[PDB]
Design an enzyme around this catalytic site. Structure first.
Site, PDB file in Angstrom:
ATOM      1  N   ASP A 104     -29.130   7.475 -25.122  1.00  0.00           N
ATOM      2  CA  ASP A 104     -28.165   8.143 -25.451  1.00  0.00           C
ATOM      3  C   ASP A 104     -28.546   7.697 -27.079  1.00  0.00           C
TER       4      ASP A 104
ATOM      5  N   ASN B 253     -21.627   9.554 -33.654  1.00  0.00           N
ATOM      6  CA  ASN B 253     -20.511   8.952 -32.635  1.00  0.00           C
ATOM      7  C   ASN B 253     -19.801   9.478 -33.431  1.00  0.00           C
TER       8      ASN B 253
ATOM      9  N   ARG C   7      -1.683  -1.231 -38.123  1.00  0.00           N
ATOM     10  CA  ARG C   7      -1.807  -3.059 -37.661  1.00  0.00           C
ATOM     11  C   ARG C   7      -1.855  -3.123 -36.869  1.00  0.00           C
TER      12      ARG C   7
ATOM     13  N   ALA D 169     -18.187   8.899 -25.954  1.00  0.00           N
ATOM     14  CA  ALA D 169     -18.327   7.726 -26.028  1.00  0.00           C
ATOM     15  C   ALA D 169     -17.305   6.845 -26.409  1.00  0.00           C
ATOM     16  N   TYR D 170     -17.378   5.973 -28.491  1.00  0.00           N
ATOM     17  CA  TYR D 170     -15.996   4.728 -27.918  1.00  0.00           C
ATOM     18  C   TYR D 170     -14.852   4.890 -27.913  1.00  0.00           C
TER      19      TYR D 170
ATOM     20  N   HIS E 102     -24.148   2.722 -34.314  1.00  0.00           N
ATOM     21  CA  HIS E 102     -24.278   1.906 -34.494  1.00  0.00           C
ATOM     22  C   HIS E 102     -25.392   0.278 -34.987  1.00  0.00           C
TER      23      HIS E 102
HETATM   24  N1  LIG Z   1      -3.300  -6.159 -31.948  1.00  0.00           N
HETATM   25  C1  LIG Z   1      -2.419  -6.736 -31.394  1.00  0.00           C
HETATM   26  N2  LIG Z   1      -0.978  -6.292 -31.705  1.00  0.00           N
HETATM   27  C2  LIG Z   1      -0.545  -7.274 -31.267  1.00  0.00           C
HETATM   28  N3  LIG Z   1      -0.628  -8.545 -31.878  1.00  0.00           N
HETATM   29  C3  LIG Z   1      -1.307  -9.567 -31.525  1.00  0.00           C
HETATM   30  C4  LIG Z   1      -2.954  -8.591 -32.024  1.00  0.00           C
HETATM   31  N4  LIG Z   1      -3.437  -9.258 -31.976  1.00  0.00           N
HETATM   32  C5  LIG Z   1      -3.742 -10.936 -31.921  1.00  0.00           C
HETATM   33 BR1  LIG Z   1      -4.080 -12.140 -32.349  1.00  0.00          BR
HETATM   34  N5  LIG Z   1      -1.898 -10.661 -31.660  1.00  0.00           N
HETATM   35  C6  LIG Z   1      -0.769 -11.889 -31.803  1.00  0.00           C
HETATM   36  O1  LIG Z   1      -1.130 -12.115 -32.878  1.00  0.00           O
HETATM   37  C7  LIG Z   1       0.235 -13.592 -32.990  1.00  0.00           C
HETATM   38  C8  LIG Z   1      -1.041 -14.260 -34.051  1.00  0.00           C
HETATM   39  N6  LIG Z   1      -0.095 -13.805 -35.284  1.00  0.00           N
HETATM   40  C9  LIG Z   1       0.622 -14.649 -35.627  1.00  0.00           C
HETATM   41  O2  LIG Z   1       0.164 -16.502 -35.086  1.00  0.00           O
HETATM   42  C10 LIG Z   1       0.991 -14.976 -37.178  1.00  0.00           C
HETATM   43  O3  LIG Z   1       0.597 -13.861 -37.267  1.00  0.00           O
HETATM   44  C11 LIG Z   1       0.532 -16.347 -37.480  1.00  0.00           C
HETATM   45  C12 LIG Z   1       1.462 -17.265 -38.458  1.00  0.00           C
HETATM   46  O4  LIG Z   1       2.434 -16.230 -39.323  1.00  0.00           O
HETATM   47  O5  LIG Z   1       2.256 -18.438 -37.553  1.00  0.00           O
HETATM   48  C13 LIG Z   1       2.660 -14.693 -36.738  1.00  0.00           C
HETATM   49  C14 LIG Z   1       2.848 -13.446 -37.476  1.00  0.00           C
HETATM   50  O6  LIG Z   1       2.015 -12.220 -38.458  1.00  0.00           O
HETATM   51  O7  LIG Z   1       3.989 -12.061 -36.452  1.00  0.00           O
HETATM   52  C15 LIG Z   1      -1.121 -13.892 -31.285  1.00  0.00           C
HETATM   53  O8  LIG Z   1      -0.814 -15.129 -30.461  1.00  0.00           O
HETATM   54  C16 LIG Z   1      -1.738 -12.787 -31.116  1.00  0.00           C
HETATM   55  O9  LIG Z   1      -0.665 -12.882 -29.895  1.00  0.00           O
HETATM   56  N1  LIG Z   2     -16.190  -0.290 -26.129  1.00  0.00           N
HETATM   57  C1  LIG Z   2     -16.867   0.114 -25.983  1.00  0.00           C
HETATM   58  N2  LIG Z   2     -16.382   1.692 -25.257  1.00  0.00           N
HETATM   59  C2  LIG Z   2     -17.333   2.174 -25.114  1.00  0.00           C
HETATM   60  N3  LIG Z   2     -18.587   3.064 -26.035  1.00  0.00           N
HETATM   61  C3  LIG Z   2     -18.547   2.201 -27.247  1.00  0.00           C
HETATM   62  C4  LIG Z   2     -17.920   0.325 -27.086  1.00  0.00           C
HETATM   63  N4  LIG Z   2     -17.890  -0.284 -28.147  1.00  0.00           N
HETATM   64  C5  LIG Z   2     -18.968   1.023 -28.994  1.00  0.00           C
HETATM   65 BR1  LIG Z   2     -19.963   0.354 -30.163  1.00  0.00          BR
HETATM   66  N5  LIG Z   2     -19.573   2.286 -28.244  1.00  0.00           N
HETATM   67  C6  LIG Z   2     -20.131   2.859 -27.998  1.00  0.00           C
HETATM   68  O1  LIG Z   2     -21.385   2.175 -28.486  1.00  0.00           O
HETATM   69  C7  LIG Z   2     -22.464   2.848 -29.153  1.00  0.00           C
HETATM   70  C8  LIG Z   2     -24.156   2.360 -29.632  1.00  0.00           C
HETATM   71  N6  LIG Z   2     -24.492   1.571 -28.622  1.00  0.00           N
HETATM   72  C9  LIG Z   2     -25.573   2.309 -28.761  1.00  0.00           C
HETATM   73  O2  LIG Z   2     -26.070   2.424 -29.569  1.00  0.00           O
HETATM   74  C10 LIG Z   2     -26.716   1.400 -27.088  1.00  0.00           C
HETATM   75  O3  LIG Z   2     -25.552   0.337 -27.160  1.00  0.00           O
HETATM   76  C11 LIG Z   2     -27.773   0.942 -28.935  1.00  0.00           C
HETATM   77  C12 LIG Z   2     -29.111   1.460 -27.980  1.00  0.00           C
HETATM   78  O4  LIG Z   2     -29.709   0.817 -27.296  1.00  0.00           O
HETATM   79  O5  LIG Z   2     -29.944   1.620 -28.728  1.00  0.00           O
HETATM   80  C13 LIG Z   2     -26.678   2.517 -26.303  1.00  0.00           C
HETATM   81  C14 LIG Z   2     -26.882   1.873 -24.945  1.00  0.00           C
HETATM   82  O6  LIG Z   2     -26.772   0.330 -25.190  1.00  0.00           O
HETATM   83  O7  LIG Z   2     -26.108   2.788 -24.116  1.00  0.00           O
HETATM   84  C15 LIG Z   2     -21.517   3.529 -30.501  1.00  0.00           C
HETATM   85  O8  LIG Z   2     -21.921   4.729 -31.549  1.00  0.00           O
HETATM   86  C16 LIG Z   2     -19.545   4.209 -29.701  1.00  0.00           C
HETATM   87  O9  LIG Z   2     -20.542   5.066 -29.236  1.00  0.00           O
HETATM   88  N1  LIG Z   3       8.292 -11.786 -33.198  1.00  0.00           N
HETATM   89  C1  LIG Z   3       7.858 -10.098 -33.727  1.00  0.00           C
HETATM   90  C2  LIG Z   3       6.385 -11.136 -34.937  1.00  0.00           C
HETATM   91  O1  LIG Z   3       5.716 -12.242 -34.201  1.00  0.00           O
HETATM   92  C3  LIG Z   3       4.440 -12.249 -33.998  1.00  0.00           C
HETATM   93  N2  LIG Z   3       4.655 -13.104 -32.169  1.00  0.00           N
HETATM   94  C4  LIG Z   3       4.517 -13.302 -32.020  1.00  0.00           C
HETATM   95 BR1  LIG Z   3       3.541 -15.294 -32.962  1.00  0.00          BR
HETATM   96  N3  LIG Z   3       4.339 -14.140 -30.779  1.00  0.00           N
HETATM   97  C5  LIG Z   3       4.796 -12.875 -30.538  1.00  0.00           C
HETATM   98  C6  LIG Z   3       5.673 -13.148 -29.034  1.00  0.00           C
HETATM   99  N4  LIG Z   3       5.141 -13.474 -28.010  1.00  0.00           N
HETATM  100  N5  LIG Z   3       6.291 -12.155 -28.999  1.00  0.00           N
HETATM  101  C7  LIG Z   3       6.210 -11.018 -29.062  1.00  0.00           C
HETATM  102  N6  LIG Z   3       5.675 -11.391 -31.111  1.00  0.00           N
HETATM  103  C8  LIG Z   3       5.600 -12.585 -31.410  1.00  0.00           C
HETATM  104  C9  LIG Z   3       4.410 -10.491 -33.534  1.00  0.00           C
HETATM  105  O2  LIG Z   3       2.797 -10.318 -34.515  1.00  0.00           O
HETATM  106  C10 LIG Z   3       5.467  -9.833 -34.400  1.00  0.00           C
HETATM  107  O3  LIG Z   3       4.362  -9.674 -35.506  1.00  0.00           O
HETATM  108  N1  LIG Z   4     -25.051   7.887 -22.101  1.00  0.00           N
HETATM  109  C1  LIG Z   4     -23.922   6.717 -21.045  1.00  0.00           C
HETATM  110  C2  LIG Z   4     -24.930   5.737 -22.304  1.00  0.00           C
HETATM  111  O1  LIG Z   4     -25.082   6.154 -24.256  1.00  0.00           O
HETATM  112  C3  LIG Z   4     -24.601   5.484 -24.414  1.00  0.00           C
HETATM  113  N2  LIG Z   4     -23.742   6.620 -25.016  1.00  0.00           N
HETATM  114  C4  LIG Z   4     -24.086   7.211 -26.814  1.00  0.00           C
HETATM  115 BR1  LIG Z   4     -25.243   5.808 -27.788  1.00  0.00          BR
HETATM  116  N3  LIG Z   4     -23.747   7.956 -27.261  1.00  0.00           N
HETATM  117  C5  LIG Z   4     -22.324   8.382 -26.603  1.00  0.00           C
HETATM  118  C6  LIG Z   4     -22.502   9.606 -26.123  1.00  0.00           C
HETATM  119  N4  LIG Z   4     -21.724  10.509 -27.442  1.00  0.00           N
HETATM  120  N5  LIG Z   4     -21.240   9.578 -24.594  1.00  0.00           N
HETATM  121  C7  LIG Z   4     -21.179   8.846 -24.383  1.00  0.00           C
HETATM  122  N6  LIG Z   4     -22.347   7.901 -24.322  1.00  0.00           N
HETATM  123  C8  LIG Z   4     -23.262   7.723 -25.067  1.00  0.00           C
HETATM  124  C9  LIG Z   4     -23.124   5.337 -23.807  1.00  0.00           C
HETATM  125  O2  LIG Z   4     -22.634   3.833 -24.198  1.00  0.00           O
HETATM  126  C10 LIG Z   4     -23.673   4.295 -22.520  1.00  0.00           C
HETATM  127  O3  LIG Z   4     -24.099   3.109 -22.262  1.00  0.00           O
END
Ligand SMILES: Nc1ncnc2c1nc(Br)n2[C@@H]1O[C@H](CNC(=O)C(O)(CC(=O)O)CC(=O)O)[C@@H](O)[C@H]1O
Ligand SMILES: Nc1ncnc2c1nc(Br)n2[C@@H]1O[C@H](CNC(=O)C(O)(CC(=O)O)CC(=O)O)[C@@H](O)[C@H]1O
Ligand SMILES: NC[C@H]1O[C@@H](n2c(Br)nc3c(N)ncnc32)[C@H](O)[C@@H]1O
Ligand SMILES: NC[C@H]1O[C@@H](n2c(Br)nc3c(N)ncnc32)[C@H](O)[C@@H]1O
Ligand SMILES: Nc1ncnc2c1nc(Br)n2[C@@H]1O[C@H](CNC(=O)C(O)(CC(=O)O)CC(=O)O)[C@@H](O)[C@H]1O
Ligand SMILES: Nc1ncnc2c1nc(Br)n2[C@@H]1O[C@H](CNC(=O)C(O)(CC(=O)O)CC(=O)O)[C@@H](O)[C@H]1O
Ligand SMILES: NC[C@H]1O[C@@H](n2c(Br)nc3c(N)ncnc32)[C@H](O)[C@@H]1O
Ligand SMILES: NC[C@H]1O[C@@H](n2c(Br)nc3c(N)ncnc32)[C@H](O)[C@@H]1O
Lengths: 257, 257, 257, 257
Positions: free
Chosen positions: C45, C118, C144, C158-159, C216
């Site tokens: 693919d 994709n 966020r 896919a993704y 990609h």
């Molecule tokens: N996708 C995500 N969803 C929720 N929490 C996430 C996250 N990605 C991350 Br990285 N985190 C949390 O973000 C924490 C760190 N962030 C921070 O410390 C701050 O960003 C940092 C600061 O201001 O000191 C806290 C805040 O902004 O609320 C990490 O320890 C994770 O627990």
């Molecule tokens: N976390 C994820 N889980 C599943 N699919 C994911 C993914 N992250 C990504 Br980026 N993808 C898919 O990965 C696709 C691209 N990958 C590729 O084209 C290849 O990696 C690229 C290639 O070899 O040409 C295909 C493969 O290795 O199977 C993207 O278009 C997404 O659809």
């Molecule tokens: N109190 C909530 C805020 O604090 C951040 N956070 C951190 Br840093 N640690 C934690 C934590 N342990 N649990 C929940 N939120 C957390 C979390 O990213 C959110 O923005």
């Molecule tokens: N056929 C499955 C393999 O191809 C990749 N892939 C791509 Br590139 N496009 C697709 C797609 N559209 N659906 C499923 N898998 C996909 C997908 O990442 C997997 O590794």
């Protein structure tokens, strides 16, 4: 005794800090940011995190305290309006201590160890990545996707929670692993909860470059051979003045305050 | 010593059972299904479940053993081809014991207690239902949806797993709560993991009729006032002959055998 | 007519390619990688994806064909053992055409347009990021988390699929948006399916640097002001020789072949 | 023209109804609950549902209107304070019409057809059940779990949403299938979106008794042989006076009003 205070850095936090220091001047309380026995953090959970890592080498001798000048935090669970009450009790109080489990992370090349209050994660240098997951020396699965997250009990309300992880009471000595966008066409899918002596190892398949994060610190590690996770032997100690249950703290943050 | 054997009831299971009994006749082993010190189950995980509940009043005096004549089970983790080896070791072996946590469920009306190896769930007498979730006497949330599931550590690979629950090592004394189709327009959403002394209570809002299940047994309870969950003080004891780790058992069932 | 052939680059793919070219030499078939009316892809693919983008400027004049020398692919759905049959029918066949919807992505600074077979995704230059999601000029939510993914119907396997997205039949002219680790303490959570004329816009809150991916290709875009998604007016055309239904293709890939 | 009005039945709803009828008495508007050309519903989304099914035999001749006396509803999207404005425009207005797709369900024994505004689901007569899922006469998977849900575009914000389903704009003629607690030790897991002519069939494996629901109506069907789903040819028509976009309605219900 010795104590120190970190501040978020805004007007509200600095002023709250200057006042508590003043109140502390009315007691036998020497300010010292080198060997404090008490560490008060003012701001949010992030400010507390920075305070944890600033003193991660004297954890066994420190009692932490979190004040929130913004929204209620899981670590910063004291209101500013109670700052003066803290001063008094901290002075001549036989206050209790509450301890939470920590996460030990080990990185090996071709060793560096770290401690995490919340979690440690691993991701790729761009695109999906592949690593082998070994549980206690037995191959468990080959992971392909965005990354993985290993979380402490208290860190389960953070990044863990967003990844479908379970919320775990911090009195349980454990770690939880969650997946980030796993491709399944073969992983467990379910989050995994490990006990005190289990060791989870992540091993590179093709690429040896990963983005490794420990709480807020994010480090691109090159030529990595292994990443080992296990429940740390060290614990973070809080000062306990009143009763503010974990589930109440969960309720106030996510359900309604 | 005394022992008994339950069978799935098909040809394969009955014959395996008749042979083990014969081998047991070559040793000092009195068959007794009233006060057995050893309970061998032949069939699947479901057969083991039935065997657990059949003897849930002498749990502290019994060591369980699961044989699978079908697919590998989490409780039935011995192959038929090892039946004779079991006989020998069970006879003159100082074999070790492995214990798993259980779930205590309490129902009150306007009390009945039960023990669960896997989980206990609550659902409505038709359509979505509403109950208040109280954690340690503090209201946590008002749930509306299909139902709720409270799960033991070993039961996390069962119903829990299908509901997005985490997989938890059975050495951890805990219980996990998951939601069934919660309507959110306000619940936590995340699964919740509780420790040994925490009590989770479910309380009716409008309707007092619920379908309550404990493992395989499902009972429509009328005029229910409260449903209480907590980690039981009782534990299930297994006989340990070899090393078959929980995560290996997880791997073989879900990843690939 | 004119045609070209891309290869995964390994032994199996190059040899299959050299043979098809030979068979094509037995017919009126001029090889031309500049203005081909037929584009055959050999490999997986991913190889097909690269072939799509290589000729994304003559899409309305090209009919694509995917051959898989490895595992069955969603785009590469022809077995090597049918290569010679393809040659014949492609020569003097009034074969039908199957068309799939594409995704148009627009990036504006302080415009660049792209087409995706994709999906297109947006992520941060490190850590969680924040953007405003505007649907048809009306603010819908402030996001966020790790990022967002906008997916075509055929890209849903896919993704999209890994992010909890729904699988959508490619005959439906639509796009689907999914979240990556959204923090909720406020997003919709559910994936969103948009129709042919709806415009979804992503706008920076604090940081103006994002990692934008289209299939990609992954490009770090600086000083970005807006990212606009909508169902493209252009479509990808396949050559149809036999009947291989989308759901059968879904079944073979994920359930069992 | 002819019209009728259903009421939730509480004080607020009955009084709003008595007033609108009065206003209608000031115009050429004959009240008739047998052959109304206009059906106004007062209460919530549930009241609207009941009104839909009450007149599901004259759908092609009726224009529906939903007023919410409680929280904002997806079908009941008019505020009470606009009731009098409705009266006027409904009288001498060439108001537009908005149509939504419906779901046709067919049950066969050893045929009964139904129409659903939201969804149709199937569950077992107790415990997990097993059915074969056939898509366009091709076996797709064997399902074991709590049940399945087939949803219309407008019904995706309802039961569908709680099961991880995607939210789909009602201008898209489609149906979406979601799983309820599927055991995987083999299903697709992902929700599935089907187009206008695709037929999804559910077939019993061992047990022939199921609980089948169509919106609010729930019927235990015995000796069932097949359950067929497809996008209906019939559509529900709304009266359109102003612009209240679907995504705005999604935002107000789930994000913040
Ligand atoms: N996708 C995500 N969803 C929720 N929490 C996430 C996250 N990605 C991350 Br990285 N985190 C949390 O973000 C924490 C760190 N962030 C921070 O410390 C701050 O960003 C940092 C600061 O201001 O000191 C806290 C805040 O902004 O609320 C990490 O320890 C994770 O627990
Ligand atoms: N976390 C994820 N889980 C599943 N699919 C994911 C993914 N992250 C990504 Br980026 N993808 C898919 O990965 C696709 C691209 N990958 C590729 O084209 C290849 O990696 C690229 C290639 O070899 O040409 C295909 C493969 O290795 O199977 C993207 O278009 C997404 O659809
Ligand atoms: N109190 C909530 C805020 O604090 C951040 N956070 C951190 Br840093 N640690 C934690 C934590 N342990 N649990 C929940 N939120 C957390 C979390 O990213 C959110 O923005
Ligand atoms: N056929 C499955 C393999 O191809 C990749 N892939 C791509 Br590139 N496009 C697709 C797609 N559209 N659906 C499923 N898998 C996909 C997908 O990442 C997997 O590794
Ligand atoms: N939706 C579901 N998904 C996965 N597991 C589920 C489930 N619903 C239920 Br109820 N279960 C599990 O089904 C278990 C009971 N089933 C059984 O004991 C058997 O059905 C009963 C038996 O044959 O003894 C075992 C089997 O058929 O595999 C419960 O304890 C739950 O753990
Ligand atoms: N678990 C669930 N989560 C969310 N929605 C659910 C659900 N289970 C069900 Br059944 N539903 C929805 O409940 C709808 C029916 N409910 C109703 O009509 C009312 O209950 C019925 C009424 O009062 O007329 C509406 C209400 O109470 O809000 C079904 O059509 C489903 O869409
Ligand atoms: N071994 C897998 C089979 O046994 C059933 N099962 C039971 Br009963 N208990 C468990 C269990 N604890 N974990 C996993 N599956 C279980 C489960 O429903 C599946 O059909
Ligand atoms: N408006 C929200 C209230 O109305 C119910 N509801 C119905 Br009935 N139909 C829908 C629907 N289609 N979408 C969202 N909620 C719906 C839904 O159960 C909720 O209680």
């Amino acid at each position: 005794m010795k104590y120190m205070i970190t501040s978020k850095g805004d007007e509200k936090s600095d002023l709250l800090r200057l006042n508590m220091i003043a109140g502390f001047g009315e007691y036998d309380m020497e300010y010292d940011d080198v060997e404090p026995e008490i560490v008060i953090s003012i701001g949010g959970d992030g400010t507390f995190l920075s305070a944890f890592h600033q003193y991660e080498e004297r954890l066994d001798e420190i009692a932490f305290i979190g004040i929130h000048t913004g929204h209620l935090g899981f670590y910063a669970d004291w209101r500013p309006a109670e700052a003066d009450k803290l001063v008094k009790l901290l002075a001549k109080g036989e206050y209790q201590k509450v301890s939470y489990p920590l996460l030990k992370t080990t990185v090996k090349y071709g060793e560096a160890t770290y401690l995490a209050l919340n979690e440690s994660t691993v991701k790729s240098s761009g695109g999906p990545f592949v690593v082998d997951v070994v549980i206690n020396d037995i191959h468990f699965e080959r992971f392909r996707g965005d990354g993985l997250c290993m979380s402490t009990p208290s860190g389960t309300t953070a990044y863990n929670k967003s990844l479908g992880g379970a919320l775990m009471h911090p009195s349980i000595e454990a770690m939880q692993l969650t997946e980030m966008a796993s491709i399944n066409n073969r992983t467990i899918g379910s989050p995994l909860v490990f006990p005190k002596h289990h060791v989870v190892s992540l091993q590179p398949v093709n690429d040896k470059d990963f983005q490794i994060s420990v709480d807020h610190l994010s480090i691109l590690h090159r030529d990595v051979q292994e990443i080992r996770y296990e429940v740390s032997a060290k614990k973070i100690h809080f000062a306990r003045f009143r009763s503010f249950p974990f589930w109440r703290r969960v309720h106030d943050s996510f359900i309604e305050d």
